[PDB]
RNA sequence: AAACUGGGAGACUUGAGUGCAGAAGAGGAGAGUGGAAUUCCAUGUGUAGCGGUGAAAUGCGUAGAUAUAUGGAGGAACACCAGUGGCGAAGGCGGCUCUCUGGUCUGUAACUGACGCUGAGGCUCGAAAGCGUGGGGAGCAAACAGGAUUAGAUACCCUGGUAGUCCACGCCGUAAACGAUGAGUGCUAAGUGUUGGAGGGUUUCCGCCCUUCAGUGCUGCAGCAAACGCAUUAAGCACUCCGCCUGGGGAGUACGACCGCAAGGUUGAAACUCAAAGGAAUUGACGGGGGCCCGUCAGCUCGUGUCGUGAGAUGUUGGGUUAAGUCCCGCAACGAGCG
């Protein structure tokens, strides 16, 4: 839902080298922006059951990528989840 | 039978050029099928939206007997 | 960027030629006060209609050309004021591309 | 998703054999190359050529047919499966079709035929029967 | 089933039952009635006698008794 | 190919069947016969025919039975290896046996097996027991028997290299 | 001992995702708006019927009906377009404009580097009917009233008519919820339609030929099936994971337990009783099924072949002609007997 300038704005600060659109940092940060905006839209339109499906699938994708990042490098994982403000 | 919207290379329909629209409606005002006019699948969707737009803005009759 | 619209309304036929200019300028203003960059405003033609709307079988068509960001509360203001007037009969706002 | 590449190889061979045409290609692997050599040594395949560009593969097999276009391999079966593995002891090595067919066994000293294993007296994982 | 389904929940067969069930009995003397003691016969006292008519399509008056 | 019917052949009845067809009024009845045919040396055929009486039926069946015949290889009174023959709901397993053990086989399959000169073999029917389909499945399973010579010829090997 | 499965340190790009450039759509939520028709109301003209059925009657009408002309009020559904078309995980989604929003497809080759698949228990959604609170209510219509029909008619038919069908918010959680066909992945002849893209040629090709992705239909081979049939959209050949079955009744019943305002839903036996119950196809007989013909009818079977796993079929079906199974032509049939 975020514009195409917000997206590049936030993938230019979780990159690692240049040209770095992959790298699970980028993907979970952009997914976090999406999930926040969709939560807003749901609070407003709470009987849009057909958009809630997409919300839930984004949440599944993010949790999966987090599991991957943890199982391979705990330092990057901790530093991220501090920087991004989650892990309740 | 050639798609007259493909005769010219016409990009937009504009629902205002009631001269072009008026050849897809019968002698009573009803929309003619994609067969009797030989147009394509998507140009037909655009044409239908065009004349439905026209009828509302009073450029074109819904029914025409009186 | 922005989005482009085309507003098209139908004025009453039997008005004079100064209330008409007053109306046109009025709605240009009240479009612009909400951040709607108007970029064209014309008369079109005098036509008869295919059915009578209120009691009228003629009317004067006027079209405007306007861009704005998609969230500005401008183009709804036109609606809300136009459906309570006495000289306009119909309007159609339409995204243009 | 693919979970058994050895079974996929075997079913390519059987599928292209039953329709009776004379070539076949697979993505390569160290185990499939082994059993392609074992299939070539006994007389089921005619040849095998190894191309390789930028991913694993590939391996090309050339089937073989009789004098009246009848088939030299008649069927082919995967024994050990991911989900139920089959290990055999040196005195349990099987004899498929009373010696007229072969079994393929992986041992501590190669991927070998079932004759070569009951001549060495060892056992291991059982890959396939081809009769 | 897959063999994982089988390992999660095994196979169970059907249970057979006699057609002479009143011949696995137990006393009613001290406490209660015990079921281990399969007999080939049992004895009793006949509380009535008489006759009855068979099913379809036989026809007779077949002699019987009721026994405790 | 055609093993041509020019030998010394001992037939055998395997089944008969009273079969009707209801017509206007009452009922018609024929007799269907199932027969096997062989010489107890390795050539066996089956065939069936129907007529209005039992002798005429069995005759037409032997007529039919002789038109087909199979080769049935063996290696010293015992089948070369193990086969499973399937034809429409009849499944029959056959194994090589021990010298002087006999034939342990059911009704229909033992007729087929004995009239080809088989002496020592074990069988089992994991299927239906309708005589026609049992006979057809049994013959379907003999056709899979492979000689030891042919295998060595098809591959690039010799015998005593694969046995 | 070190091939395979597991563990540890690495490396790779094909699976999976991301970036960049594009495409289609009754996908969903909110807010306004348009015309056609039905009902009621108001007014003018207007004379005796209207309405309804297989026939009638009940009903409305000389307090001026029906018809006809002009004006208002309200509600619900969206003609043509419209299509074995499109979209959605399913239930489902069709007038028009704007706002907010989910997914799919195609090309490319910046990037990450196996991040994947399936999923008991758990959550979310789920036609119609039904339940609660407060609105709305034109047409249709359970229950109900009146008229008919019949031996009777607590039905079918006619005149009326309440809940409900509609909106907001809660509850319910079931359907022949069906393709009676769980999801992922690879492999195996061809021919022909249509929806959305991408490349090459001839080039007004933007209308034509060829190739290639993803949907959606028809025909058909190997193979499969008990037959029906299925067949690159498998019911074929194979691997992974889940759900479920084990003769018919008793019975989705009883008991216990969880859920629900209720109605009920989910879970789920045994005692006893029968020797069958089923699927698919075959020949007859029947139908308040259909078509052709005609005005002593023209039919009933066999032998050798071929077809079918089998009962069986073919012949004896088809065109024409004839009073005629009477003749000709064609055809896995060729001949024969009584008519």
Automatic annotation (TrEMBL), chain A:
<comment type="function">
    <text>Forms an intersubunit bridge (bridge B4) with the 23S rRNA of the 50S subunit in the ribosome.</text>
</comment>
<protein>
    <recommendedName>
        <fullName>Small ribosomal subunit protein uS15</fullName>
    </recommendedName>
</protein>
<keyword id="KW-0694">RNA-binding</keyword>
<dbReference type="GO" id="GO:0006412">
    <property type="term" value="P:translation"/>
</dbReference>
<dbReference type="InterPro" id="IPR005290">
    <property type="entry name" value="Ribosomal_uS15_bac-type"/>
</dbReference>
<keyword id="KW-0687">Ribonucleoprotein</keyword>
<dbReference type="InterPro" id="IPR000589">
    <property type="entry name" value="Ribosomal_uS15"/>
</dbReference>
<dbReference type="Pfam" id="PF00312">
    <property type="entry name" value="Ribosomal_S15"/>
</dbReference>
<comment type="similarity">
    <text>Belongs to the universal ribosomal protein uS15 family.</text>
</comment>
<keyword id="KW-0699">rRNA-binding</keyword>
<comment type="subunit">
    <text>Part of the 30S ribosomal subunit. Forms a bridge to the 50S subunit in the 70S ribosome, contacting the 23S rRNA.</text>
</comment>
<feature type="region of interest" description="Disordered">
    <location>
        <begin position="1"/>
        <end position="23"/>
    </location>
</feature>
TrEMBL record, chain B:
<dbReference type="GO" id="GO:0070181">
    <property type="term" value="F:small ribosomal subunit rRNA binding"/>
</dbReference>
<comment type="similarity">
    <text>Belongs to the bacterial ribosomal protein bS18 family.</text>
</comment>
<protein>
    <recommendedName>
        <fullName>Small ribosomal subunit protein bS18</fullName>
    </recommendedName>
</protein>
<keyword id="KW-0689">Ribosomal protein</keyword>
<dbReference type="GO" id="GO:0022627">
    <property type="term" value="C:cytosolic small ribosomal subunit"/>
</dbReference>
<dbReference type="GO" id="GO:0006412">
    <property type="term" value="P:translation"/>
</dbReference>
<comment type="function">
    <text>Binds as a heterodimer with protein bS6 to the central domain of the 16S rRNA, where it helps stabilize the platform of the 30S subunit.</text>
</comment>
<keyword id="KW-0687">Ribonucleoprotein</keyword>
<keyword id="KW-0694">RNA-binding</keyword>
<comment type="subunit">
    <text>Part of the 30S ribosomal subunit. Forms a tight heterodimer with protein bS6.</text>
</comment>
<keyword id="KW-0699">rRNA-binding</keyword>
<dbReference type="GO" id="GO:0003735">
    <property type="term" value="F:structural constituent of ribosome"/>
</dbReference>
From TrEMBL, chain D:
<dbReference type="GO" id="GO:0019843">
    <property type="term" value="F:rRNA binding"/>
</dbReference>
<dbReference type="GO" id="GO:0006412">
    <property type="term" value="P:translation"/>
</dbReference>
<keyword id="KW-0699">rRNA-binding</keyword>
<dbReference type="InterPro" id="IPR047863">
    <property type="entry name" value="Ribosomal_uS8_CS"/>
</dbReference>
<dbReference type="GO" id="GO:0003735">
    <property type="term" value="F:structural constituent of ribosome"/>
</dbReference>
<comment type="subunit">
    <text>Part of the 30S ribosomal subunit. Contacts proteins S5 and S12.</text>
</comment>
<dbReference type="InterPro" id="IPR000630">
    <property type="entry name" value="Ribosomal_uS8"/>
</dbReference>
<protein>
    <recommendedName>
        <fullName>Small ribosomal subunit protein uS8</fullName>
    </recommendedName>
</protein>
<comment type="similarity">
    <text>Belongs to the universal ribosomal protein uS8 family.</text>
</comment>
<dbReference type="GO" id="GO:0005840">
    <property type="term" value="C:ribosome"/>
</dbReference>
<dbReference type="GO" id="GO:1990904">
    <property type="term" value="C:ribonucleoprotein complex"/>
</dbReference>
<comment type="function">
    <text>One of the primary rRNA binding proteins, it binds directly to 16S rRNA central domain where it helps coordinate assembly of the platform of the 30S subunit.</text>
</comment>
TrEMBL record, chain E:
<feature type="region of interest" description="Disordered">
    <location>
        <begin position="1"/>
        <end position="54"/>
    </location>
</feature>
<comment type="function">
    <text>Interacts with and stabilizes bases of the 16S rRNA that are involved in tRNA selection in the A site and with the mRNA backbone. Located at the interface of the 30S and 50S subunits, it traverses the body of the 30S subunit contacting proteins on the other side and probably holding the rRNA structure together. The combined cluster of proteins S8, S12 and S17 appears to hold together the shoulder and platform of the 30S subunit.</text>
</comment>
<protein>
    <recommendedName>
        <fullName>Small ribosomal subunit protein uS12</fullName>
    </recommendedName>
</protein>
<comment type="function">
    <text>With S4 and S5 plays an important role in translational accuracy.</text>
</comment>
<comment type="subunit">
    <text>Part of the 30S ribosomal subunit. Contacts proteins S8 and S17. May interact with IF1 in the 30S initiation complex.</text>
</comment>
<comment type="similarity">
    <text>Belongs to the universal ribosomal protein uS12 family.</text>
</comment>
<feature type="compositionally biased region" description="Polar residues">
    <location>
        <begin position="26"/>
        <end position="41"/>
    </location>
</feature>
